[PDB]
Design a protein around this ligand. Structure first.
Ligand SMILES: [Cl-]
Length: 171
């Protein structure tokens, strides 16, 4: 889009997108919740160990770039963070549940095959088949909205090709 996400910025975005679907009872996320989601040993490639201050800096960056938004009010005053990335009242980025699951999984685990994404994105959206994941990836690369996923050159002896998100540039 307008702002290209760094490796750590894409992880913070991917965490808030994932937790909004998987754990709605803990959304919006506090600073500790974002930090914990960033450094999870599971559903994360690569596994990170970002400090609380680093996460807050990334949170501050994505807020002023209008990808996140601060929520406070009262209730222990602990400031929470929502996603302005997709499907807000404001912005023009509209992503279906199938495309949210695909985008979030690649944001958190990097380049993956449709077979991989069929398993690792079901947590956020169960695809009835692999034709759904295939149709989801094909859509996000065709929208005049912009190319959101690229399909990398297929590996030798691989059998399936890998796809990568384009919120952090070209590979
Ligand atoms: Cl730090």
């Amino acid at each position: 889009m307008k702002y290209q996400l760094s490796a750590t910025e894409a992880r913070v975005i991917g965490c808030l997108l994932e937790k909004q679907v998987t754990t709605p009872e803990q959304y919006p996320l506090s600073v500790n919740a974002v930090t914990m989601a960033c450094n999870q040993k599971t559903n994360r490639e690569p596994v990170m160990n970002l400090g609380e201050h680093e996460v807050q800096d990334i949170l501050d960056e994505l807020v002023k770039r209008h990808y996140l938004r601060t929520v406070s009010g009262f209730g222990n005053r602990v400031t929470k963070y929502e996603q302005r990335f997709c499907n807000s009242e404001f912005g023009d980025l509209k992503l279906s549940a199938a495309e949210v699951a695909v985008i979030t999984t690649l944001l958190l685990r990097g380049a993956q095959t449709p077979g991989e994404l069929r398993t690792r994105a079901s947590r956020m959206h169960e695809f009835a088949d692999m034709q759904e994941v295939e149709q989801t990836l094909d859509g996000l690369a065709t929208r005049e909205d912009g190319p959101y996923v690229v399909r990398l050159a297929r590996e030798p002896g691989k059998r399936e090709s890998r796809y990568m998100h384009l919120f952090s540039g070209e590979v």
